[PDB]
Write an enzyme that holds these catalytic residues in place. Structure first.
Site, mmCIF file in Angstrom:
data_model
loop_
_atom_site.group_PDB
_atom_site.id
_atom_site.type_symbol
_atom_site.label_atom_id
_atom_site.label_comp_id
_atom_site.label_asym_id
_atom_site.label_seq_id
_atom_site.Cartn_x
_atom_site.Cartn_y
_atom_site.Cartn_z
ATOM 1 C CB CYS A 18 6.545 -3.382 9.751
ATOM 2 S SG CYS A 18 5.210 -2.537 10.234
ATOM 3 C CB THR A 58 -1.094 0.058 1.238
ATOM 4 O OG1 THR A 58 -0.304 0.083 2.268
ATOM 5 C CG2 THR A 58 -1.830 -1.154 1.175
ATOM 6 C CG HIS A 112 5.527 -1.084 2.981
ATOM 7 N ND1 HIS A 112 4.433 -0.940 4.148
ATOM 8 C CD2 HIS A 112 5.084 -0.653 2.085
ATOM 9 C CE1 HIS A 112 3.468 -0.398 3.507
ATOM 10 N NE2 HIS A 112 3.806 -0.050 2.268
ATOM 11 N N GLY A 113 8.530 -2.755 6.011
ATOM 12 C CA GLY A 113 9.659 -3.651 6.000
ATOM 13 C C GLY A 113 9.258 -4.822 7.050
#
EC number: 3.4.22.56
Lengths: 240, 4, 240, 4
Positions: free
Chosen positions: A135, A34, A93-94
């Site tokens: 994350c 996203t 993101h991660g």
């Protein structure tokens, strides 16, 4: 001269150093990731914050995993001889140990290895700071009511969240971590050592933030960041 | 609020 | 009264708290794990060091994985209301995220979860320190020539070594980390904040130690410890 | 010197 001590990094080189900000907002459709709304607030905050610390800030937006690796490679091959330190900020993101390019993941260890003491000589002995808003897993915190030096030495990982846990981002205000980081650098960079600043950041995030969600699973959750220090000295952003 |  | 600040943990409770030392030297033959020579030097150093900080020290030797979990469970179910803090010291074989009982492994997360803010209420808001002398992998460092609060808040992990790396122990002198830790607590506990003490520990290990081995693979290797802080305040072992 |  008189007695001399040594427990603080030398930060009076001609330049404070680079601050590389990788701001990943939009992701290739095929990845299924996203858009990270509010991350631009974050990038802009960091840019202003580190500008005031006299870092040479470079903002990069929406980099593929290839672009991330080649950027880090190129930056690491620069001559940092006249720079006191290095800062890299990752916004994406991660997952644990992992950061996402727009088209797929990058091992964090791949990025940081470029700057190892034996691989970037103009940064050997100098603080290398990696600030990661991403994350580290899918756990939620439900809270409770109240040669001669190691090649891994002189790194600091300022993680937005505890190992294994999600990291929270507000699409209007920006991420909890980066908001708190910039505020605390603003107020305390001219007086506190960096670990003590980051500790204030821990408390700010731990105390002032709590998720609100229509989805019960993600509602009323808390976050604590994680300072991972391999530094060998105290770091003050100012000098005398 | 959203997660990364 | 006059203006009051709050950025340091309250350490003037009647008791400083417990210091649990788990000293694993001899391992069941079936595990295939070697005896950890020199660990007793370490246990004894820590005992003396933390005694002087006025911790109630409990030493435990050669615990099975079962014994480790039940000990941590029992300690977590005590009333810590009159104690300022909690310290646990793990000395054993390990791998990333993992510590060994004498008969097999224990998830570190299993041990630390007992003390989560929601699961040990008499320790909520108080510093919980986990000091771990154990391997986090098999990498070698070749060096270079020179509700309302999160349940994970208020933890500090003082790792002996960087993620993914071996940790070094000297069979005569004790481990590099624990040696350096005790010396720095000795010299600086009455004047420095804990993060600044642990940073001196990083430097001591990074600068003063280097392996000597007849085996080329393990010879001339370096080590840097890793401070992982989820603390929300400054920690001074003394009060005024 | 030995590793853990």
């Amino acid at each position: 001269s008189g007695i001399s001590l040594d427990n603080s990094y030398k930060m009076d080189y001609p330049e404070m150093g680079l601050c590389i900000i990788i701001n990943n907002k939009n992701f290739h459709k095929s990845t299924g990731m996203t858009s990270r709304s509010g991350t631009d607030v974050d990038a802009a905050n960091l840019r202003e914050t580190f500008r005031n610390l006299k870092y040479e800030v470079r903002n990069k937006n929406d980099l593929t995993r290839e672009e991330i690796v080649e950027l880090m490679r190129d930056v690491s091959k620069e001559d940092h001889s006249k720079r006191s330190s290095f800062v890299c900020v990752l916004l994406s993101h991660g997952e644990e140990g992992i950061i996402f390019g727009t088209n797929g993941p990058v091992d964090l260890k791949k990025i940081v290895n470029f700057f190892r003491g034996d691989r970037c000589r103009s940064l050997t002995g100098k603080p290398k700071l990696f600030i990661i808003q991403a994350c580290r897993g899918t756990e939620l915190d439900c809270g409770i009511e109240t040669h001669k030096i190691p090649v891994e030495a002189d790194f600091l990982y300022a993680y937005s969240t505890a190992p294994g846990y999600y990291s929270w981002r507000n699409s209007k205000d920006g991420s909890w971590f980066i908001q708190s980081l910039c505020a605390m650098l603003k107020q305390y960079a001219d007086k506190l050592e960096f670990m003590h600043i980051l500790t204030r950041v821990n408390r700010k995030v731990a105390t002032e933030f709590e998720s609100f969600s229509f989805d019960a699973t993600f509602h009323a959750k808390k976050q604590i960041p994680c300072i991972v220090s391999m530094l060998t000295k105290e770091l003050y952003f100012y000098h005398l | 609020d959203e997660v990364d």
